[PDB]
Amino acid sequence: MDVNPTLLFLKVPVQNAISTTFPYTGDPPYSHGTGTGYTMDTVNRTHKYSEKGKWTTNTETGAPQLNPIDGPLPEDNEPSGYAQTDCVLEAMAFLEESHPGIFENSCLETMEIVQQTRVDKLTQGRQTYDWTLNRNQPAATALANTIEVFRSNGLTANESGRLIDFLKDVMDSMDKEEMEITTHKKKQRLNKRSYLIRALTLNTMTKDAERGKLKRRAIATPGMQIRGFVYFVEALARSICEKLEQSGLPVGGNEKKAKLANVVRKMMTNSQDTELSFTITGDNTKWNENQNPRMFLAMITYITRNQPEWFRNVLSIAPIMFSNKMARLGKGYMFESKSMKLRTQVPAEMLANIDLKYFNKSTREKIEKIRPLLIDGTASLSPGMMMGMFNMLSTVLGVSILNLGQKKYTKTTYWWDGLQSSDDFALIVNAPNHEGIQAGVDRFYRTCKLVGINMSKKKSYINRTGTFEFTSFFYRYGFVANFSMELPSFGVSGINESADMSVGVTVIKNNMINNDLGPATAQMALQLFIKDYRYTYRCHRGDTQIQTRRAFELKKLWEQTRSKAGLLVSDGGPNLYNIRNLHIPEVCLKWELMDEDYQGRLCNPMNPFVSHKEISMEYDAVATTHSWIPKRNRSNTSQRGILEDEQMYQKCCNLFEKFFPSSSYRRPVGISSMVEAMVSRARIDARIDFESGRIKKEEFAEIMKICSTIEELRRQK
Amino acid sequence: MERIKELRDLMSQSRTREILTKTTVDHMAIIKKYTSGRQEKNPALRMKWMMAMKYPITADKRIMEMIPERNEQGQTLWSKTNSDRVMVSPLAVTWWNRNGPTTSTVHYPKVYKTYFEKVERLKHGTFGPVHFRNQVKIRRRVDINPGHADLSAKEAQDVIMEVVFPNEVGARILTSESQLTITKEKKKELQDCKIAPLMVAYMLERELVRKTRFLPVAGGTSSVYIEVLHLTQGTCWEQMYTPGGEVRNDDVDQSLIIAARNIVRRATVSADPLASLLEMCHSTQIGGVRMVDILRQNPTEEQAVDICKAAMGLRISSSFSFGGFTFKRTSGSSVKREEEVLTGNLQTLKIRVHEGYEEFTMVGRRATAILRKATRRLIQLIVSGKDEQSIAEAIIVAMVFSQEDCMIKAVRGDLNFVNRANQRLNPMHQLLRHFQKDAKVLFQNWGIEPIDNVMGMIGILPDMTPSTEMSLRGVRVSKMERVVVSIDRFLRVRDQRGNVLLSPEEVSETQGTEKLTITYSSSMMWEINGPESVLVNTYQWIIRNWENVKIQWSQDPTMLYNKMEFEPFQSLVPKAARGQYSGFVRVLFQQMRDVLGTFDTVQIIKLLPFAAAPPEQSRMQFSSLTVNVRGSGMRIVVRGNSPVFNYNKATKRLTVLGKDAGALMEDPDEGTAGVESAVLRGFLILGKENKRYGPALSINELSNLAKGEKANVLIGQGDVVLVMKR
Amino acid sequence: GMEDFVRQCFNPMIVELAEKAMKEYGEDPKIETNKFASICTHLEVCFMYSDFHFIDERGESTIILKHRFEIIEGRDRTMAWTVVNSICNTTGVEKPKFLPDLYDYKENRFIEIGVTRREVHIYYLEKANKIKSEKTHIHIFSFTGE
RNA sequence: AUCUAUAAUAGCAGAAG
RNA sequence: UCUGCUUCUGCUAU
RNA sequence: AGUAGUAACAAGA
Numbered sequence A: 001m002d003v004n005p006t007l008l009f010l011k012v013p014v015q016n017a018i019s020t021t022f023p024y025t026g027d028p029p030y031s032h033g034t035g036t037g038y039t040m041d042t043v044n045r046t047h048k049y050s051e052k053g054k055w056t057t058n059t060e061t062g063a064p065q066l067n068p069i070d071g072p073l074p075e076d077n078e079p080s081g082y083a084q085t086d087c088v089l090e091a092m093a094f095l096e097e098s099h100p101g102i103f104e105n106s107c108l109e110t111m112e113i114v115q116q117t118r119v120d121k122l123t124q125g126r127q128t129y130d131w132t133l134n135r136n137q138p139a140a141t142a143l144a145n146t147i148e149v150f151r152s153n154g155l156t157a158n159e160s161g162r163l164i165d166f167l168k169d170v171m172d173s174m175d176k177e178e179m180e181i182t183t184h185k186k187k188q189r190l191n192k193r194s195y196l197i198r199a200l201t202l203n204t205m206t207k208d209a210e211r212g213k214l215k216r217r218a219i220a221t222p223g224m225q226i227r228g229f230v231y232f233v234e235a236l237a238r239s240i241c242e243k244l245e246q247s248g249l250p251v252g253g254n255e256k257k258a259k260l261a262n263v264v265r266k267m268m269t270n271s272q273d274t275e276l277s278f279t280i281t282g283d284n285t286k287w288n289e290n291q292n293p294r295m296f297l298a299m300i301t302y303i304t305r306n307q308p309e310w311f312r313n314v315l316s317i318a319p320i321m322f323s324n325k326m327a328r329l330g331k332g333y334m335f336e337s338k339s340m341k342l343r344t345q346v347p348a349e350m351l352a353n354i355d356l357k358y359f360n361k362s363t364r365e366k367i368e369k370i371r372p373l374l375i376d377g378t379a380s381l382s383p384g385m386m387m388g389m390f391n392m393l394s395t396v397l398g399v400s401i402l403n404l405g406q407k408k409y410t411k412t413t414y415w416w417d418g419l420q421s422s423d424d425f426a427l428i429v430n431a432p433n434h435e436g437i438q439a440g441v442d443r444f445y446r447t448c449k450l451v452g453i454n455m456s457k458k459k460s461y462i463n464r465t466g467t468f469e470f471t472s473f474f475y476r477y478g479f480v481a482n483f484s485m486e487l488p489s490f491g492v493s494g495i496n497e498s499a500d501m502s503v504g505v506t507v508i509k510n511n512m513i514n515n516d517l518g519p520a521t522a523q524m525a526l527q528l529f530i531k532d533y534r535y536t537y538r539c540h541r542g543d544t545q546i547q548t549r550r551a552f553e554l555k556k557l558w559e560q561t562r563s564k565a566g567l568l569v570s571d572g573g574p575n576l577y578n579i580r581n582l583h584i585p586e587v588c589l590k591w592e593l594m595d596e597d598y599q600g601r602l603c604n605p606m607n608p609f610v611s612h613k614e615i616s617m618e619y620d621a622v623a624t625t626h627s628w629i630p631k632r633n634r635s636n637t638s639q640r641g642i643l644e645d646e647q648m649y650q651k652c653c654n655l656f657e658k659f660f661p662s663s664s665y666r667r668p669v670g671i672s673s674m675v676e677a678m679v680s681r682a683r684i685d686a687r688i689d690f691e692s693g694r695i696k697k698e699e700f701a702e703i704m705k706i707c708s709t710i711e712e713l714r715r716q717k
Numbered sequence B: 001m002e003r004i005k006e007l008r009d010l011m012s013q014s015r016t017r018e019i020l021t022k023t024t025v026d027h028m029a030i031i032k033k034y035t036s037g038r039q040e041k042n043p044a045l046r047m048k049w050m051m052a053m054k055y056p057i058t059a060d061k062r063i064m065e066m067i068p069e070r071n072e073q074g075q076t077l078w079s080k081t082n083s084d085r086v087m088v089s090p091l092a093v094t095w096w097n098r099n100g101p102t103t104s105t106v107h108y109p110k111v112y113k114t115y116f117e118k119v120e121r122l123k124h125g126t127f128g129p130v131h132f133r134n135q136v137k138i139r140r141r142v143d144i145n146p147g148h149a150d151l152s153a154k155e156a157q158d159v160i161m162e163v164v165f166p167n168e169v170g171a172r173i174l175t176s177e178s179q180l181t182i183t184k185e186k187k188k189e190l191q192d193c194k195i196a197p198l199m200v201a202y203m204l205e206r207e208l209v210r211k212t213r214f215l216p217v218a219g220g221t222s223s224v225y226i227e228v229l230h231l232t233q234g235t236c237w238e239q240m241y242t243p244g245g246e247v248r249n250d251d252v253d254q255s256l257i258i259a260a261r262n263i264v265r266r267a268t269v270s271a272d273p274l275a276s277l278l279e280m281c282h283s284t285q286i287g288g289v290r291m292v293d294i295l296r297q298n299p300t301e302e303q304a305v306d307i308c309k310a311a312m313g314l315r316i317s318s319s320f321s322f323g324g325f326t327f328k329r330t331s332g333s334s335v336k337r338e339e340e341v342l343t344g345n346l347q348t349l350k351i352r353v354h355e356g357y358e359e360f361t362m363v364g365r366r367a368t369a370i371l372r373k374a375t376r377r378l379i380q381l382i383v384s385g386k387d388e389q390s391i392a393e394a395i396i397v398a399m400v401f402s403q404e405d406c407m408i409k410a411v412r413g414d415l416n417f418v419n420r421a422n423q424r425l426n427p428m429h430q431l432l433r434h435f436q437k438d439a440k441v442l443f444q445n446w447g448i449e450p451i452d453n454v455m456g457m458i459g460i461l462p463d464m465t466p467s468t469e470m471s472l473r474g475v476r477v478s479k480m481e482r483v484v485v486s487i488d489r490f491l492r493v494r495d496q497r498g499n500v501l502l503s504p505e506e507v508s509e510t511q512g513t514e515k516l517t518i519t520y521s522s523s524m525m526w527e528i529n530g531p532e533s534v535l536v537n538t539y540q541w542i543i544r545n546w547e548n549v550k551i552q553w554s555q556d557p558t559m560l561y562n563k564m565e566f567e568p569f570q571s572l573v574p575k576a577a578r579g580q581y582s583g584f585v586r587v588l589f590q591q592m593r594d595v596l597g598t599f600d601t602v603q604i605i606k607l608l609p610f611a612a613a614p615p616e617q618s619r620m621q622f623s624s625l626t627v628n629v630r631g632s633g634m635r636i637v638v639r640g641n642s643p644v645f646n647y648n649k650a651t652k653r654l655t656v657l658g659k660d661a662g663a664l665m666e667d668p669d670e671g672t673a674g675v676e677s678a679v680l681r682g683f684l685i686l687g688k689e690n691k692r693y694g695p696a697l698s699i700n701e702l703s704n705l706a707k708g709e710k711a712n713v714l715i716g717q718g719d720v721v722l723v724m725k726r
Numbered sequence C: 001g002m003e004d005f006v007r008q009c010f011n012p013m014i015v016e017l018a019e020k021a022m023k024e025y026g027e028d029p030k031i032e033t034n035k036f037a038s039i040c041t042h043l044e045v046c047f048m049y050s051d052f053h054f055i056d057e058r059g060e061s062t063i064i065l066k067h068r069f070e071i072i073e074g075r076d077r078t079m080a081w082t083v084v085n086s087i088c089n090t091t092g093v094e095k096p097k098f099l100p101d102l103y104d105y106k107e108n109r110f111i112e113i114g115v116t117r118r119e120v121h122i123y124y125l126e127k128a129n130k131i132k133s134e135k136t137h138i139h140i141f142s143f144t145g146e
Numbered sequence D: 001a002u003c004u005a006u007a008a009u010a011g012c013a014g015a016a017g
Numbered sequence E: 001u002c003u004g005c006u007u008c009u010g011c012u013a014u
Numbered sequence F: 001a002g003u004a005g006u007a008a009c010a011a012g013a
Ligand SMILES: *O[C@H]1[C@@H](O)[C@H](n2cnc3c(N)ncnc32)O[C@@H]1COP(=O)(O)OP(=O)(O)OP(=O)(O)OC[C@H]1O[C@@H](n2c[n+](C)c3c(=O)[nH]c(N)nc32)[C@H](O)[C@@H]1O
Pocket: B253, B254, B257, B258, B300, B301, B302, B303, B320, B321, B322, B334, B354, B358, B400, B401, B402, B403, B426, B428, B429, B506, B508, B509, B510, B511, B512, D001
């Protein structure tokens, strides 16, 4: 017998065993070299889908920009970026007509959002392009560098702390004759065009650890001048998506499954009995490369009708900046000579003035096709969205096309509705016969073509209503469990012993709750997690023979302890977990069983493995000694000048927390400097203390004198 | 003193001074998150890659004086690193755990009291049997952390800020009396606390702040049942369990209302609703406690709870609840009908409108009122509240209760009548919630009328000002018991005089979900379950017993139709339809036993529950039959498969609402000729379209044909077929 | 031109405080110059109403040590509310629903200062009604001397 | 009965597009 | 010159 | 050589 696992589908429906088809036990594919190839190929595809558009030269950056809007209607079924503005405006108008007041209410909530949001929001980002260094940096570091450069250039509206004031600072920065960068101290001066190109740049990197793809692709990260505007636009689009029944966003998880099930259920209820009902499991092809920023500007302009003009402007800036964006090419390439046995790095900035003899066929073609767009090591990319930068606005566009499917708009016997999550979509078509179904599908496809949406024909299929797939959720008369997708969440997390126990047990319990993890498999998952935990942390049961550096101390503690069942697993104790007590932490689970001296040692108030805060008297520690801190190795470049800046930053922040007790519980607000706030707090505290009677004459005088000394030092350095 | 000298030291230098001066407080958080290095990624690999090393831990240098450099085996516990940090081995952690200074004062039980409450709830819990069953889990929002019953999340956070950080609350003021009481008790309980204020704040967040999540739930949705959801509810099994602590009375009241409504609804279908209802309440538990024992000691005001109390010879209130006020009808009657209305924000929605004149005593705690109303009309409202805010509360509640078109058109803004998961919300509750935040527009669009100044009372104006001249259109201000009942075989609750006080028709049709798990013990553990469970289990019972059911469907069909097993199904059928549906199905079955060769097991199984009603004659042909699931009418199509009942001819496994019901064996007398005798009333389907007999006409167009005549009908899901009139 | 006048009319510390006050809420001192002048006048009236007033070690007010007044105006919103909350938690005085301008330790009460261009009756009445707390002091000055 | 929300600390990890 | 955006979920508290 | 797969590693300073 030849074993064929796929033959199991001959009896078990594919949905009820979909977990088999997800091979998430092996490592995911990574990229190894540069991402310049994928970046250039993305730019060339974007300009190929819009090649019949109009070419112009940007008077501000000098970049060739392609405009495919209102271009010739497509003649074939290849992806097209030729969205018609009148069709997009009609889709918006009919979405507002079908849901009266959606855009007005969304604009009110977004006005509140825009007026209250702080600049600190921008620090909630991951790796960000930093134009001051022309490199990727943490979002908070990039924002701090931007604020420092803006301040040294006389731009200080961001001192208000509001995001919109920082956006005004960005707007004013885009009008300066020259930008001063002060490194460490080399004083560089960018001119208007160079600073402008750096401000409209999105750094490009290759996406790593991605399942389901044979070939790698490029992702983009914008700078700080783009992120605030994109945040405001995405907030407006999220407010809109929240009010739409077809939107699969921003709902996620169990709430998303419930919404999808209820909406599909209502759709099947609305469909009359004599009607034929079909469902398209549909993907859209080249979604981000055919989403035009000009159509996003049209959508925002229609959505913000009759709003204050400042609001329309601040919402219009993101599509404008994305219409004039530049894509940084990346790291370049690497060249090898076998005969000379040497290798060298060729930067991307010299890919326009390099000889094409060095490259293979396809890379030479890429460079030849992309050379007219190269400026300062970036490529002009007017069309496209550059990989999920306006997820919610493109969701709104897709939902508008879905909304165009009611019988009041089709004016025929067929109609359609469905679900839209950015690019993914489930389309339910109803019609009195099969010809009507075909006509409705053709009309939906062509209407999508009219707005720059291209249904992937090779990835989409259609069947009688009742089963479909939407955003990796498989629906067979109801959504099925897919446990494999949550498989990489099982294991030792690497935080510390306590946190790893908590995470392992909690993951097992939540997988029992959400992903149909059965009780026997849950017990076996518990056993496997305890094995992996004991291996990782060298904390095998005291009464064992495994030889490790920790085993002697564990044997001593084991033989020392009367009640062994109270010892934590990290202390070589037994595993008392079962299905009953997964929701209970480990220290609480066996608190009754602990020996008194072991319990008073594990939870000692003067625990030396956790940090202690001053009130040299300190607060008592509560955590156990298993909550230690892992050494983080961060030691070979020239970027070692920031280690001292960060150390002094930390010193200042600890002093501030000594003056402001709630600063680390909630984010502090204030336009005053740190010294001013701290001195005023010290003064008012000394006053209400001398008054209430905790300090005397002389201590109050001394505090007031030190405050006056600090204030004359801040005025007189 | 220390800190001000520290600040002066940093300002004496040059770079720290420039930092302290040229950095606002808002940018301090930015410079606080400011990091330098290559960040970090995939820490699990890092942990596996550093635990084999000698010193993977970083600690403060103070540990030099607490942990020795070497143990009794010469293994190094810490090593100096070229600063205040020091690299440390896990052997140091174990050496502290076995030799460190011990104490009798640990803070862990106090800081983590909620986890010990979970421990105590598990320790004193009671385990029942495990029942393997067809499980229907529904995704809904439930409480993961219950929090304080009085406070809301916002109020709890305000209390926590006031308790832990008094001088940092800003403009905020604690308004509620519960907020002030809990703040007083927490500030009293936390003096001379040796715990850092951050950890105290997080302990209070665990104690007070309510937290919710969307989860797939079966059984009780209360937090004491959600915390053990992994243990009690599985894919195919229910583990009977009762937590150890004390139950909240609110959850008991809610679950009692749910169980009573389910029981009354299922009892109305029985031929003896009184005995059926008594059997159900005798065979029902709510959170482990017997239902009859709850009914004898629970002062819950609800129609179905009062019917349950009356059937067991108890005193009832004959009252209900609405908008926080207790309503007691003093005179009048009413029926309930579905009415579609358009709101002020252009949202169409159906409301249960009560037709008939009636009068009510509406009692709150800070207000009280006499109401008189008709079909969507507030005839009279005499409020007698204490404060003008309570007066306004009672007025708003009465305007919403009246179901006036002025009230429905006063809706402004982004008022949603659906859930975030697109689930139907109660329209009346939504209107109340909308107008309780601001009812200015409602007060303007209500109307005014002049007062005659009778009895010395004074009327109120839309500006909440007392006026002797004019008032609202029917509103007047003023300056200011369990009865023995009977019940008959059909659950009509008469008084001592003889006038009807309650009826099953007054029971709310909303199918809710219990807070505490409801346990039913009988032949069918699903008899008083939700609609999805009832449908799945009805069809599963039909096909599980298909041998005797099939033998009985031919010998004595009347005996089969009368079985109790179909009565939970019949409570989901709309009442006005039941008889008609029954008649239809029965005629189908009869014309199925007359035509030899036409035997479809799937058709019989599909239509068998609908034949459980007294059959009313009709000439209507049904293409589908409606069952009420969660406020929506799901249609079971007479021919072919549907989304509530689909038979896979390949796997032979019937699927009901996505839940497997089981396989159908091979019937030798199955009809492969293609003829159908159980689709249309008085018509045999002989196959596909024959263009000889003309174009296709409608299902409801077939009533004028004559016997011995074929035709083409567009009967089904867009399927044209050829039928003939018998 | 108003800008220039303000820049030369008031002290640099008052001007800096006004600059901070209008910069906190997104107002340009170069654009909205009348609000610049109003805020400078408010700050100057407050810093003259406060200064040269102390309480000696026995407990009464002497004009020349424990300052008689606590300046609440001209602070950041957070620092102002911190001062107000600390005063309330120490002296046990009712918390004002809005930020006041001064606090009097001797009289133990929050002072709301107003500097009106129009009649003092109108302004005063309006402010009083808005506050609706019969505990906060309201002292209204005008440029006419009333 | 409602409850991303009559809501907003932050970081990390998993999944999805 | 190298883990982006968005959404959900879980854990933790420099 | 091998890993690997559209570009890299097969040490770097
Ligand atoms: O959680 C649900 C329920 O269990 C809970 N509840 C109900 N009763 C109590 C008591 N007594 N104590 C604590 N909690 C209680 O509140 C929720 C109500 O359930 P839900 O299904 O959401 O709504 P319900 O179907 O009960 O209808 P509702 O709008 O709440 O009205 C309740 C009651 O009011 C009657 N009623 C309304 N109107 C406008 C009426 C009218 O014009 N004329 C007459 N005669 N009655 C009217 C409703 O029919 C119900 O009887």
